[PDB]
Symmetry: D3
Subunit: 241 residues, 6 copies
């Protein structure tokens, strides 16, 4: 391979410059098969990668794993092989009561509750998505009869205390995060997930385009524990046309 973790070479990508980057390795083949000629590339650690064709254009589909650290490896190594655009498709918990399970959120920018973003820029830098890519995501939603929620997401390095979940072994949340969900609710933040702050900060600072769409699987105003994929594919087609 020509990269350290992913097991890929540039030739395997057939000129792809755009990647769809789900968190879950098990979702990669499913996404690839929404496109044409889905082709296995590699699987190592949490990084499963496929190639497929979106209206004739090559697209890499590669899992990131959960969290900014594993995401940062995948993004860098794909960029080493010529990828310059990264479309995340994920799952998310809504924190606003008006967002329903099954809805779609397009993240414009993220609250940086991660560590890896700080390995690309100091905190003052905004974890903002690429405008053109966000625009394509919104258009793809509307083409499908979905009005997405568009706004700010809290992007956390933990699933449990950093999303102010209390149904845990200790039931404690450290002072920094105690009360934090209500703070983000009051600031209009839509939802929590675990990769977008890293993704957006690393891509914005390194000259790559990023965007994120996620399906809502729980509403945190109700409970702690309970398609986006069709939209991300449609957005990829818009961007590669």
């Amino acid at each position: 391979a020509d990269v350290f973790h992913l097991g890929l070479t540039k030739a395997m990508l057939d000129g792809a410059t755009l990647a769809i980057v789900p968190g879950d390795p098990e979702r990669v083949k499913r996404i690839a098969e929404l496109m044409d000629n889905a082709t296995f590339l590699a699987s190592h650690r949490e990084y499963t990668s496929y190639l497929a064709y979106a209206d004739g254009k090559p697209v890499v589909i590669c899992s990131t794993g959960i969290g900014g650290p594993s995401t940062s490896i995948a993004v860098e190594e794909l960029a080493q092989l010529g990828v310059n655009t990264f479309l995340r498709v994920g799952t998310t918990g809504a924190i606003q009561p008006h967002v329903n399970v099954g809805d779609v959120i397009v993240t414009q920018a993220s609250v940086r509750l991660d560590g890896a973003s700080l390995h690309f820029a100091p905190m003052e830098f905004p974890a903002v998505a690429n405008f053109e890519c966000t625009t394509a995501m919104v258009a793809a939603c509307r083409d499908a009869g979905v009005e997405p929620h568009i706004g700010v997401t809290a992007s956390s390095d933990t699933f449990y205390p950093g999303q102010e979940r209390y149904d845990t072994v200790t039931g404690r949340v450290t002072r920094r995060f105690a009360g934090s969900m209500k703070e983000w609710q009051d600031m209009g933040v839509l939802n929590y997930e675990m990769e977008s702050a890293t993704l957006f900060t690393m891509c914005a600072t390194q000259g790559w385009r990023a965007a994120c769409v996620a399906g809502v699987i729980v509403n945190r105003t109700q409970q702690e524990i309970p398609s986006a994929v069709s939209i991300v594919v449609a957005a990829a087609k818009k961007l590669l046309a």
Copy 2:
């Protein structure tokens, strides 16, 4: 008045819910006069305000002054009078070599090199513009045949050291900011100005819509301050009025 600084009452706004917020009180009249029935409202401190009508709907035009602190007062007090959308029109210094003087920049989000944004949200929160408003600014640029630069802006509480200017009395920049311009350049940041981080943070956290367009007056890869040699087109002021019309249509 109904508010403590601006000298305005709610009635003076005639139902306006959208403001155009230039930094310079002296720019307010010219912006207002691009619309219909421009009328002077008030002038107190750095806050000069006019009303005008865009395709029949009232728009308030109110300066902010330079910096987040004076901006924060104008935004809050306008919001107390019913304003929920704030379109900043500004001037800016570009830091990328081929962003020409006379170009326009639409700021999608800002590096928070300000203090006032922290009075609305901790640093981790993104100083991001409203999507619909940013979209309207981009569309207005394109209608006028200008492809804007769209990206991240460094929004500083100083003009001199925080923008790494050295042609100053002491010629020194404190450690935090020494080398910083190159850091933002390397990160693809387009430009510097002095109000958008506060504006965007305060609006996003309080439920208001904000956006920012600015004309480039100097390119920092060539000059610290523009002079008569600097390049001397489509104005940011015409663009922000066009964007307001789109939003209000």
Copy 3:
């Protein structure tokens, strides 16, 4: 002009090395007129400037606007034209219960609730006024039969949440500032204003002298905003201090 914002040249200052720097452009003429031969210099943006003479010595009077950012421009550009001493005169809200409306506060040092001071020094550096200029302010108060309150001021980048005002559209204050007024009260801080932390930090680190006197316009233990029920001028004091310093 020879500076980018103020519209001034060195010649226009007629040798002045001391500036009186109110926040409000509309106050500049009034201050100038307490001195002799008041002369308009320029007005651009929030920066109105006059020249006048204090017992025969030239003094520039130049507004800063509200906030550290606009202050930082006026101070640097005035220093480029030879000013080395900056006497702020302002308005302020008191936070101790027996600091009355109409009283005067001489700020010795400030709590740095601003961003611009960090563009001159890291947070550990004290936002402290010049001792000789503070002393002159105190002497001027006492010459007028006013005992000033002398102490620490909280210098904020906002009027509303950073001063823990709640009578706002959202009625919310972010976590950092929730409970903060009480913290400053408990620490003996006298008052809030919006320019002194920047002023003092930038002047101390660049080799210039600064000081700040302000009139109390509201007491925050009683009211957020003064109204018609709310109860010697700071401007007369600052002029008297300038005379002491330039004699």
Copy 4:
């Protein structure tokens, strides 16, 4: 399942209270098979889990994935199923000239170059391993004829800039990490890896025991079976 990510129930663990937690899911089977009656349990996302028996006592082997975030989910969910002791066995890059390929590092504590640790304690708190478990790791090394290097590890949320790698697309390292490798070298830091600050901070603050032993696979300045055999030996010591 009884937990949201791992796909496990408490009954599947047969009363296990100790977990061996490698980063790589593809390493789990190999560790499990060093013990008795190894049995595949589940695989979901980066979390592959097996059960095996160490001198008659059940031990869970569960991968974490790379990084503190995915590790934090695995540790919490294993703890919800009754696990109280977490032994990491990983790979690492050495940054001291005297730490040779083939040597073993036992991490006593970590430089917190991560974000997840802050979701358990503010930065002042030390990302320190459990003394008893560290002691068992050291004894297991020595039983194998290895004197381990025992010391501080830099635990980074990135592989590239946070380890001051310049062999990247942009070739840039943000100011925070510029010159940082030399700073850690000068402070005696032995190596970089990507999970121990989170693991140690979360375990210390939540009342669980953690330790970490890793094989040196590269030395930035200039074994695989050994490190896994050692962690299994340490587990047996702790369970005896």
Copy 5:
């Protein structure tokens, strides 16, 4: 004793409300003996205490030890016994070339390169001396024919790396402090010492008066390692008590 560390009771102070607080326990007697009826009170740990009388009024003289932590104990426990004014007399290294060995510096405020100040207020709060007490220190200097240096001091929790000294076992200074002495020089900072940031922040926030005068024993523009400050602090105390 009425306090945890100093070994003092309120009665031992005979009504003293002002303390002179040198760093060095071994300097306390000398200072006390500049006043009347100097009396040894106690010695425990780094805290040696004497009483003396300045123009008829009792003054306590109590060492702090080096650093904010030990200072913070002495100040609090003296305040528990009724002390409300703390005049530090110290030694210091100058970092400006125009300040000579033997000169005196009156610290108006300090760069908070300490930890204990943060146990009284967040960093944004200024480590500033009391105006009246600083005024008395300046007046005492002038009465003695010395124009003091009046300004900002860098107050460090270390003698070695936090003062950017390199003549050490490792010869290294961590990144935060590398280059820092030049930063402070350029900002007009006069000198380094090790107690004033803590003293000033704790006193300002707790409602007590503090000031600091120190004699310059080295100039750091020349070397890392190489009195009338004591006569001056006593004279300042007299002014404040008159």
Copy 6:
């Protein structure tokens, strides 16, 4: 002298490479006299230093004063004279109900509630004791029939507010430390003291070995003096054997 504060030269130490560093200068002689041929070296400020012999090997006993700052001077200056190992024996207040008066605490690592540690490394670096020295302390405890509590200590630059003490003139604790004792209790922290964060961080970063043992004489939630000093001497012997 060879060093500015302690008043020592290298020759005076007779080759000693290990120091026992109590806080209280008055404790120095008492520690020294548990060893052989106790010999006064110097006394300046809060720094009283003795030499004595532990199983034939020279050991320095030198007080630090209270707090990181004065400790940092003593450690550096002793290291300039060849000392490479620093064993603290101190006093402490316990904050866990199960830690009884009479018990012993061996501090493995510290919460950095100090300033001087930051003059050696940024906050991310762990204030961790040397493993071999900690191991010797634990063995010394057990040789004497004591099972020590081994864990994390909160190391504060103040006795009063930073230990969340309200028994003060003002009765106030600044926001940073309000509620902090409970936070440390919930994280398993055993006790407060005032030097170990500085000692551990400075020693780890400069290449020296440090450890810390303390007898519990009080507990914030609810003979020993002789025991803690006997233990540290026994640990020194293990280390110099």
